[PDB]
Amino acid sequence: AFFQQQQLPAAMADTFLEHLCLLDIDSEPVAARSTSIIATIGPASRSVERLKEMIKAGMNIARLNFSHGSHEYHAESIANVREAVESFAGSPLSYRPVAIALDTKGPGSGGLSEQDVRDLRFGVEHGVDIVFASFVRKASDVAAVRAALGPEGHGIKIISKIENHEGVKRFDEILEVSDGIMVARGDLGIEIPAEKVFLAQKMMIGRCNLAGKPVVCATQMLESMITKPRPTRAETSDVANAVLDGADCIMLSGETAKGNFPVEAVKMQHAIAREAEAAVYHRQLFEELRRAAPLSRDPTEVTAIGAVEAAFKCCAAAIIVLTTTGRSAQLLSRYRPRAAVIAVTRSAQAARQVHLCRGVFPLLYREPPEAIWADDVDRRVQFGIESGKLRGFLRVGDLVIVVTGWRPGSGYTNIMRVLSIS
Amino acid sequence: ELGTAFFQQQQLPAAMADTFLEHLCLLDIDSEPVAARSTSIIATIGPASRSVERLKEMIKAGMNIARLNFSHGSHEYHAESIANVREAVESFAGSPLSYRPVAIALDTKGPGPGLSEQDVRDLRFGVEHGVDIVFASFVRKASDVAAVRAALGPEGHGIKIISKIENHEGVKRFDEILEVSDGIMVARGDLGIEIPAEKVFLAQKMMIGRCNLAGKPVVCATQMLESMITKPRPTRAETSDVANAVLDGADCIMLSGETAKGNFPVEAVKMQHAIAREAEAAVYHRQLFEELRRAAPLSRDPTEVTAIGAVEAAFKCCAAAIIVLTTTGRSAQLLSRYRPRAAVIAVTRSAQAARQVHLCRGVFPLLYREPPEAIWADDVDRRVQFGIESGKLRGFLRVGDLVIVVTGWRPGSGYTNIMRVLSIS
Amino acid sequence: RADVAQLTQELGTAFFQQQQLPAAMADTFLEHLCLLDIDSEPVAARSTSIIATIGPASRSVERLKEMIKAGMNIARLNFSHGSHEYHAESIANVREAVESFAGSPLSYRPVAIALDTKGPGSGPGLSEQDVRDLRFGVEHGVDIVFASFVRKASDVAAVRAALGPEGHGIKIISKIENHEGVKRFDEILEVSDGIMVARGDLGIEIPAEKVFLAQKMMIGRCNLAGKPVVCATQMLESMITKPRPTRAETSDVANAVLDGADCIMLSGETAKGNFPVEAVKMQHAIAREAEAAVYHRQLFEELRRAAPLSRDPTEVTAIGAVEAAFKCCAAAIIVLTTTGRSAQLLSRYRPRAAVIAVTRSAQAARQVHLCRGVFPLLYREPPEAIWADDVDRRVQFGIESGKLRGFLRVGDLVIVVTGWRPGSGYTNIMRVLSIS
Amino acid sequence: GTAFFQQQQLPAAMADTFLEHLCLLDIDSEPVAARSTSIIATIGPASRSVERLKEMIKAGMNIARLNFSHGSHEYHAESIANVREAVESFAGSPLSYRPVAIALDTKGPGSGPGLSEQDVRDLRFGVEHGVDIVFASFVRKASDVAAVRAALGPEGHGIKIISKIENHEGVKRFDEILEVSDGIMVARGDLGIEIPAEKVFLAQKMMIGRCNLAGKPVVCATQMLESMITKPRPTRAETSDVANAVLDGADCIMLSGETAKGNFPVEAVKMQHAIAREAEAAVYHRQLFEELRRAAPLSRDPTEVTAIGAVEAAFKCCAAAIIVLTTTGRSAQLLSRYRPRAAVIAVTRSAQAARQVHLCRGVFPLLYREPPEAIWADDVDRRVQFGIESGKLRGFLRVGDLVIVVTGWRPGSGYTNIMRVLSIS
Numbered sequence A: 001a002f003f004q005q006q007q008l009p010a011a012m013a014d015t016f017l018e019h020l021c022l023l024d025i026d027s028e029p030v031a032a033r034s035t036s037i038i039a040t041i042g043p044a045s046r047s048v049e050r051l052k053e054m055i056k057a058g059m060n061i062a063r064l065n066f067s068h069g070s071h072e073y074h075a076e077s078i079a080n081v082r083e084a085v086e087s088f089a090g091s092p093l094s095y096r097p098v099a100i101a102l103d104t105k106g107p108g109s110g111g112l113s114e115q116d117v118r119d120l121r122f123g124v125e126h127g128v129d130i131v132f133a134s135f136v137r138k139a140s141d142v143a144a145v146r147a148a149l150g151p152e153g154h155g156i157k158i159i160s161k162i163e164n165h166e167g168v169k170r171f172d173e174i175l176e177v178s179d180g181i182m183v184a185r186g187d188l189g190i191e192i193p194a195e196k197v198f199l200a201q202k203m204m205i206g207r208c209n210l211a212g213k214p215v216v217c218a219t220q221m222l223e224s225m226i227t228k229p230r231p232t233r234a235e236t237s238d239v240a241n242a243v244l245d246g247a248d249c250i251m252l253s254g255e256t257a258k259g260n261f262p263v264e265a266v267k268m269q270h271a272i273a274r275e276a277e278a279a280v281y282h283r284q285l286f287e288e289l290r291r292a293a294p295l296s297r298d299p300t301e302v303t304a305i306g307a308v309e310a311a312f313k314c315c316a317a318a319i320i321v322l323t324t325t326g327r328s329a330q331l332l333s334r335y336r337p338r339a340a341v342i343a344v345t346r347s348a349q350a351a352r353q354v355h356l357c358r359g360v361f362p363l364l365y366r367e368p369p370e371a372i373w374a375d376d377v378d379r380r381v382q383f384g385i386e387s388g389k390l391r392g393f394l395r396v397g398d399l400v401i402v403v404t405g406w407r408p409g410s411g412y413t414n415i416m417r418v419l420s421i422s
Numbered sequence B: 001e002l003g004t005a006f007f008q009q010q011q012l013p014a015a016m017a018d019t020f021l022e023h024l025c026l027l028d029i030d031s032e033p034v035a036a037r038s039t040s041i042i043a044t045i046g047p048a049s050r051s052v053e054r055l056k057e058m059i060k061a062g063m064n065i066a067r068l069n070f071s072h073g074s075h076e077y078h079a080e081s082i083a084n085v086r087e088a089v090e091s092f093a094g095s096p097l098s099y100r101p102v103a104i105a106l107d108t109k110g111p112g113p114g115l116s117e118q119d120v121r122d123l124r125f126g127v128e129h130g131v132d133i134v135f136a137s138f139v140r141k142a143s144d145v146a147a148v149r150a151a152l153g154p155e156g157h158g159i160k161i162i163s164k165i166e167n168h169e170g171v172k173r174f175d176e177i178l179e180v181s182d183g184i185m186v187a188r189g190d191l192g193i194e195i196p197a198e199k200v201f202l203a204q205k206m207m208i209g210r211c212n213l214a215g216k217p218v219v220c221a222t223q224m225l226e227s228m229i230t231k232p233r234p235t236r237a238e239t240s241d242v243a244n245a246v247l248d249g250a251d252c253i254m255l256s257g258e259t260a261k262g263n264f265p266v267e268a269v270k271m272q273h274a275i276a277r278e279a280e281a282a283v284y285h286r287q288l289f290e291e292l293r294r295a296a297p298l299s300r301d302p303t304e305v306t307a308i309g310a311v312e313a314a315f316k317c318c319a320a321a322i323i324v325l326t327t328t329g330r331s332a333q334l335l336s337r338y339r340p341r342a343a344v345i346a347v348t349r350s351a352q353a354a355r356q357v358h359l360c361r362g363v364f365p366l367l368y369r370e371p372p373e374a375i376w377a378d379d380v381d382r383r384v385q386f387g388i389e390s391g392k393l394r395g396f397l398r399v400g401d402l403v404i405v406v407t408g409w410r411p412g413s414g415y416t417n418i419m420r421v422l423s424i425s
Numbered sequence C: 001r002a003d004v005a006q007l008t009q010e011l012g013t014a015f016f017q018q019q020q021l022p023a024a025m026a027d028t029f030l031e032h033l034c035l036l037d038i039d040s041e042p043v044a045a046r047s048t049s050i051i052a053t054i055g056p057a058s059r060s061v062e063r064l065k066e067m068i069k070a071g072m073n074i075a076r077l078n079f080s081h082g083s084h085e086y087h088a089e090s091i092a093n094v095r096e097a098v099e100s101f102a103g104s105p106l107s108y109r110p111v112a113i114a115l116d117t118k119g120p121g122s123g124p125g126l127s128e129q130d131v132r133d134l135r136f137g138v139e140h141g142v143d144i145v146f147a148s149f150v151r152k153a154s155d156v157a158a159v160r161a162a163l164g165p166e167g168h169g170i171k172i173i174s175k176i177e178n179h180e181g182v183k184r185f186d187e188i189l190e191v192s193d194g195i196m197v198a199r200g201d202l203g204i205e206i207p208a209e210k211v212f213l214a215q216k217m218m219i220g221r222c223n224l225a226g227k228p229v230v231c232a233t234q235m236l237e238s239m240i241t242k243p244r245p246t247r248a249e250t251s252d253v254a255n256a257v258l259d260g261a262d263c264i265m266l267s268g269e270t271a272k273g274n275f276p277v278e279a280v281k282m283q284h285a286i287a288r289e290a291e292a293a294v295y296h297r298q299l300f301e302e303l304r305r306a307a308p309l310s311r312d313p314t315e316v317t318a319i320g321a322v323e324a325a326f327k328c329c330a331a332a333i334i335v336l337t338t339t340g341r342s343a344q345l346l347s348r349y350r351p352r353a354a355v356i357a358v359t360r361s362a363q364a365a366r367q368v369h370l371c372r373g374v375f376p377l378l379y380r381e382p383p384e385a386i387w388a389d390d391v392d393r394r395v396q397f398g399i400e401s402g403k404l405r406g407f408l409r410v411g412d413l414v415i416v417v418t419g420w421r422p423g424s425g426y427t428n429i430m431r432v433l434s435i436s
Numbered sequence D: 001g002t003a004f005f006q007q008q009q010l011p012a013a014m015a016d017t018f019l020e021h022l023c024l025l026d027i028d029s030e031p032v033a034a035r036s037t038s039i040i041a042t043i044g045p046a047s048r049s050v051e052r053l054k055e056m057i058k059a060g061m062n063i064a065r066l067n068f069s070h071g072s073h074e075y076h077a078e079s080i081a082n083v084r085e086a087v088e089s090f091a092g093s094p095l096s097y098r099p100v101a102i103a104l105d106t107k108g109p110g111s112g113p114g115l116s117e118q119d120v121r122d123l124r125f126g127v128e129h130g131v132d133i134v135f136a137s138f139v140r141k142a143s144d145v146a147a148v149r150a151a152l153g154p155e156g157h158g159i160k161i162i163s164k165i166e167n168h169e170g171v172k173r174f175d176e177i178l179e180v181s182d183g184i185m186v187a188r189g190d191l192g193i194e195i196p197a198e199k200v201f202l203a204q205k206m207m208i209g210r211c212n213l214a215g216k217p218v219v220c221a222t223q224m225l226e227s228m229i230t231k232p233r234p235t236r237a238e239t240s241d242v243a244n245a246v247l248d249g250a251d252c253i254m255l256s257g258e259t260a261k262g263n264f265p266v267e268a269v270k271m272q273h274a275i276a277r278e279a280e281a282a283v284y285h286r287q288l289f290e291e292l293r294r295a296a297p298l299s300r301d302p303t304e305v306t307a308i309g310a311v312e313a314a315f316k317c318c319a320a321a322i323i324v325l326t327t328t329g330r331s332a333q334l335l336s337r338y339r340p341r342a343a344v345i346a347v348t349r350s351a352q353a354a355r356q357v358h359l360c361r362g363v364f365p366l367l368y369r370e371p372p373e374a375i376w377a378d379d380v381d382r383r384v385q386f387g388i389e390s391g392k393l394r395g396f397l398r399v400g401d402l403v404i405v406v407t408g409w410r411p412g413s414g415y416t417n418i419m420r421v422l423s424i425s
């Protein structure tokens, strides 16, 4: 029964053609949904009660579109998101962190506009986790956004939106200085021929996967759901193909901001992403990512590849990793393990931000500390196991890979352990 | 010899990549497509696309197959649509650069326990009106195909039966259906109501993969550019869907309400043409050819053996075309199954085979009507030169190019066994 | 170039020109061959063990010390000739030469003692002389038995029974020397600790032109099973009388290593020849060149694809450790082992990094020479009060001994493999450590 | 049949990995194909008798090597006459006649910087006596090859120059030497004294790999069966060395003292024949063909394009043979470079080309002696039928086998462009 589920016959295929031939509509997905969902907050999704339903449906990142609405409007949206998120904090083993992303208005006819400087300052003051920087055309645009965030915004992730020909042509220099990328297909589809957008999307996703940096696919993914309860056949195909392409996140704009079915749009992206993740041909994907990732003398990078290899060898249900900044979890995610990456962190901001990385499930640790550091580490690993059992990731008898470091503080991950559950 | 400009076009840097990941990383929006569009476009005929003048614009835009939906309209209405298609097609007979065959496909209303009475009558209408293809609705098992075949009667055994897979049973019994069918249509409209909407992409990719393995045509259909029924431009999901159906391996892509009743039928055809050309250049031929070769069983059939040798030879020299002489279309179909980048120019005396080979990706039919030469070898050479001169006129070939030529050792269908390398003079 | 660019700037272009590294980075086996370079010098310690047959040319204590220095790892006693008294004196001379280097535990070289049986002769199974010779082996503490003319699984069960309850730790290496042994190979390998491709008799029992097929098949199946395989007989035959071997002989040694042999053997070359020390030096020089020429990119990929999924934590840790070692160009993998098993499971994935096996068992230290790339370090300190401290001291002993021997250098990365509790069978941890 | 797929290591040939290919090698799986690696035997006192030479031709000797380091011109002229007399004693049965090449191995430069005066005289003797090949000793750079070519004069333009790599400089300047040479010899005797003995296998494997990539013949030489100079059977290292030279990709294997002066010249040839047949069946063609195709550059030469198409077609149908008509041997050499499992039966009228194609693995030369037919197409057909009749008599072909036939569009060398699938009747 285990080997009939989650497209495992198609996963064992010797060629990509045979993998396609073995895909089975009756093979049910079992793993938790790996690709994060970004939902744009607006009149249709602003209330606390509506936001609770969207969190339950699968929303991981709330997007604030600063092209419309005042600072007062956006501050109320942020407060409503935080109220809905904290309503589930009473059960720490099941609590789900939700990131808040600020999407800038952009440069308009201008570099960094004066409104963007004020909006970025608002973001830092309100503790946003991510900035989706509009119309990034070159590396100096990213440096300007970074400078506008100041010393208090050092920890905010900058995701550069590629929306025109120049952004595509200067992609490598933009990715180098960015934390990640958004394929902003709306403007991209007007700036370059509509029939070429799929080439830009596939190229950018491939380069972000190679760099190990998050990539978001955005705009018109389930467009018809703004007025209709069910999407078109092209829309479900688009969501599935963005996941198969290698996107870390998928996005909803008008579908959740102003449409009549915001919760249903989130549920639809969740249902498609789960099916598409099981249909990923891991045999070729892992081989290619492993071959292309450069040789490294960084112990976190070395431990990450060893852990992902070990996970595939034993069909590990999960890789439990301790992380301060999210970096150790991101380096595991870049190798696209089938095993869920359960990231145990004390940082509420890192817990929200790791939603940008495919297959990272953040757990915010709030248990009393242990006097002995080695005992504190072990208690965090047991917390990952207990949350994993409650959420359906793990069962007694499963094997897990545990990734830790040799001393406290960020940057010292160097250990991988094989553990039997219970 | 060819220049650096040649190797920058048609996604050639991405084509030379050693891995699929590197192939994706090398895709370039500035690398322009050069080859002729190989995925056929099926447009549904209706009130928005029935007039002779509108049909001429749709042929110019790229329509290769006209679909008649027998779920609506009388026999008289469909006979007038067929006459209008034929009138629009024959209006280009004066210019060899513009004349193109257009297939006519009858899409049945569907089943009741067996073949419905209306389907028996509609299939008989198809034979009487000389249709080329039947898109058989709601095929659930091999006996449904046998019933459609029997209803094509004494005169219509040459009509191609494309089975529409629209429900759970058709998906589960796919192998037995494909075995007795000429091809398959992934009919996503009903399929998306019969099975969970989130599973349709799995059924589409599986059916396309199995048809590619079997060397039989597969059509991707329904809601590909849906928003274009009322809007002049499609959504980002719609252009992505068309490109991904071509990258999946679909031989044909289809338009339904977009051309039958929408406000922009010509624009919908133009959009499918533009996307398909871009997506065909983005196909990773290096892995695709290797996998089709490895999966295809060994064969002692000379047509099959010649086809793989010709496709291998075409890749070796960057051949502009493979010119094949065919009476039934079979030798061209066996070349098409290996997905050459070279266009397959199929020269035939059969008007029906010329229309039907539009079902096979990358087959460009040329209908030959000259009186037959007394010496067979001279008649073969005249048809090969007709393919070369048509290719020159249409932009496929230039003097100095290399072409692969596929013929047989004697007249009649079934004897293809020869592959030649010719320098265009 | 992007996959090695940062490491090339850090370690230098000279590092990536040595040990056939340009040929190692090739995308195809054909390109790997085209890039093999006679100017690319080997750097790694020799990983294929050398078995030398003891005889009149190599029996003295002084001669044995030179053979240990030249690279002999396993001493073979051929029980087809010589009395029990003769073989007991050979064993005592080997042990005296081995213990003459015990003064420095960090450098000392364990040497295994292997008993090669006379065989069944015209009989159907275990002969009476073999029963007596196997009892002599147990009484004299031999580490390995090379069982002659093994034809079926019941032959190895008979050898096992003759070793008695006190010889349970002795490794049984089945010699495949005839058609039946080749045809029943799978059942023989299943119950054996390893195999010897005994080409002398095999080349008379089957057509001489088919021996290479049997050798390549048996080496491939042993590599797939993760069990040691020895290539034997006439590898450097002309060196019995000449100081230099023929072109076919150097080729044969290199190809046995490239095929995947864990051990290579010398018979008359060391037992009776005029150049026993030179024959050992020649096998050492060829094996180091051939080990660097192994196409690890395809070999590692194929060993992972063919090896079934495992729920054994030692097996899971071993593949993770070998993958980590390749990622950082690790100098060594340091492993703690009681029986040798954790080191054997690392060895089956054929890492380029040396596997430094730290053990308290003198017998396991001798026996791990059967596994390619395992360098045994015998730890003699009494146990620390706290088990975690005792584990740490053994890891540090491997590091310090490694540095003092040129295996490790300051700045190198090392992979360390340990377990969660004392006793054999609990290896489950892999650590990345920087050498300071 | 199942018996067919159990022979010639076919279970090991179908393996998905090289490791699984090794695990499936079977000592009971008998070789079926004809031996494709040529055997060069050095002529000396043990192999000069016309009667002894007839036995060596029957045992499998394809090339007779004359070592000009020993013996006078008078001695070598008698060797040549004895070889020719033994070879021509079988000319009375044209369907079984085996051509045998004559190769002149030069003394070398000695302590000098380039072409010695004795080599100039020996090379002139070679041209005057019609030798087919020159094995040029101690080639260190491209100018050494040009000097050998100049010494052959205007009448020796058709002689093949095989450069012997015997020292460090030859290995380091390998690429420039291969570029101007017809092929290479890995001369392990001197190479093993000029560089450390333990590094010779690296130079051998590298040079064989680069020659396979370039599509040029490579010879493995010296001490392959050394102990057979005095003993009836070789050592285990010697049989392994022969098998590994074939597995490495050598086109030819050589015997020196084993045939020139030893007591078992015929047995040494029989032993190389037996080992080479076993080793050729153990070649992992799945990976080898894939890598040769991937590495071989794109080509606009029709002979090269036809060759890859023909080899691909041969693998698809398990063709018993590829029958090629050739004037210079070039069309057969281009087929050989893709290492088909099918035997390349090369039909030629050139006695010299028939002798020289023995340098290319898997090429079986057939010398055609009939004068040209009046109709060129009939002359082509008669030569193809001669290849079939020779193949049937020699055991290469049987009724029911498929063969690939490679011809050109006009008489004269350089116009091969046709591949055809033929059933043996």
Ligand SMILES: O=S(=O)(NCc1ccc(Cc2ccc(O)c(O)c2)cc1)c1ccccc1
Binding pocket: A016, A017, A018, A020, A209, A244, A245, A246, A280, A281, A282, A283, A284, A285, A286, A288, B020, B021, B024, B209, B212, B247, B248, B249, B284, B287, B288, B291, B292
């Ligand atoms: O491992 S992957 O999932 N590769 C998917 C993939 C797609 C197309 C083809 C080429 C082909 C196209 C269509 C075919 O039907 C067919 O047989 C072959 C081969 C492989 C992967 C994904 C993302 C990044 C790296 C790697």
Ligand SMILES: O=S(=O)(NCc1ccc(Cc2ccc(O)c(O)c2)cc1)c1ccccc1
Binding pocket: C029, C030, C033, C220, C223, C258, C259, C260, C295, C298, C299, C302, D018, D019, D022, D247, D248, D249, D283, D284, D285, D286, D287, D288, D291
């Ligand atoms: O297709 S071939 O015959 N390749 C042979 C080959 C040998 C070793 C390995 C590396 C390895 C892998 C697995 C092993 O078991 C093992 O002993 C060594 C991989 C491939 C071929 C020959 C020549 C040129 C191109 C191609």
Ligand SMILES: O=P(O)(O)OC[C@H]1O[C@](O)(COP(=O)(O)O)[C@@H](O)[C@@H]1O
Binding pocket: A322, A323, A324, A325, A326, A327, A328, A329, A403, A404, A405, A406, A407, A408, A409, A410, A411, A412, A413
């Ligand atoms: O992923 P990051 O940010 O590098 O954090 C990993 C760090 O987490 C740990 O596992 C635990 O550290 P803390 O006890 O400081 O939380 C460290 O050993 C390791 O360096």
Ligand SMILES: O=P(O)(O)OC[C@H]1O[C@](O)(COP(=O)(O)O)[C@@H](O)[C@@H]1O
Binding pocket: B325, B326, B327, B328, B329, B330, B331, B332, B406, B407, B408, B409, B410, B411, B412, B413, B414, B415, B416
């Ligand atoms: O593709 P099909 O229908 O098998 O037809 C291929 C046939 O066409 C030819 O090339 C030409 O045949 P005709 O002269 O009869 O048209 C034959 O030699 C070959 O058998």
Ligand SMILES: O=P(O)(O)OC[C@H]1O[C@](O)(COP(=O)(O)O)[C@@H](O)[C@@H]1O
Binding pocket: C336, C337, C338, C339, C340, C341, C342, C343, C417, C418, C419, C420, C421, C422, C423, C424, C425, C426, C427
């Ligand atoms: O390779 P083996 O024989 O399984 O030994 C590995 C064992 O060695 C250890 O690392 C140390 O164990 P000891 O303290 O008993 O020597 C164990 O944790 C582990 O189980």
Ligand SMILES: O=P(O)(O)OC[C@H]1O[C@](O)(COP(=O)(O)O)[C@@H](O)[C@@H]1O
Binding pocket: D325, D326, D327, D328, D329, D330, D331, D332, D379, D406, D407, D408, D409, D410, D411, D412, D413, D414, D415, D416
């Ligand atoms: O291999 P080569 O030397 O190019 O010879 C191939 C030539 O042989 C032929 O098949 C037959 O030519 P001939 O009739 O002159 O012998 C030509 O058509 C072709 O060009």
Ligand SMILES: O=C([O-])C(=O)[O-]
Binding pocket: A134, A161, A163, A183, A184, A185, A186, A187, A188, A218, A219
């Ligand atoms: O800004 C965006 O999100 C877009 O243009 O798609």
Ligand SMILES: O=C([O-])C(=O)[O-]
Binding pocket: B137, B164, B166, B186, B187, B188, B189, B190, B191, B221, B222
């Ligand atoms: O009939 C169709 O085309 C469908 O249901 O998609």
Ligand SMILES: O=C([O-])C(=O)[O-]
Binding pocket: C148, C175, C177, C197, C198, C199, C200, C201, C202, C232, C233
């Ligand atoms: O016994 C042996 O070692 C042999 O036969 O090779």
Ligand SMILES: O=C([O-])C(=O)[O-]
Binding pocket: D137, D164, D166, D186, D187, D188, D189, D190, D191, D221, D222
């Ligand atoms: O000259 C030769 O043949 C050699 O040195 O091997």
Ligand SMILES: [K+]
Binding pocket: A065, A066, A067, A103, A104, A105, A106, A134
């Ligand atoms: K915005």
Ligand SMILES: [K+]
Binding pocket: B069, B070, B071, B107, B108, B109, B110, B137
């Ligand atoms: K219909």
Ligand SMILES: [K+]
Binding pocket: C078, C079, C080, C116, C117, C118, C119, C148
């Ligand atoms: K013995």
Ligand SMILES: [K+]
Binding pocket: D067, D068, D069, D105, D106, D107, D108, D137
């Ligand atoms: K000479």
Ligand SMILES: [Mg+2]
Binding pocket: A134, A163, A184, A186, A187
């Ligand atoms: Mg935008």
Ligand SMILES: [Mg+2]
Binding pocket: B137, B166, B187, B189, B190
């Ligand atoms: Mg329908």
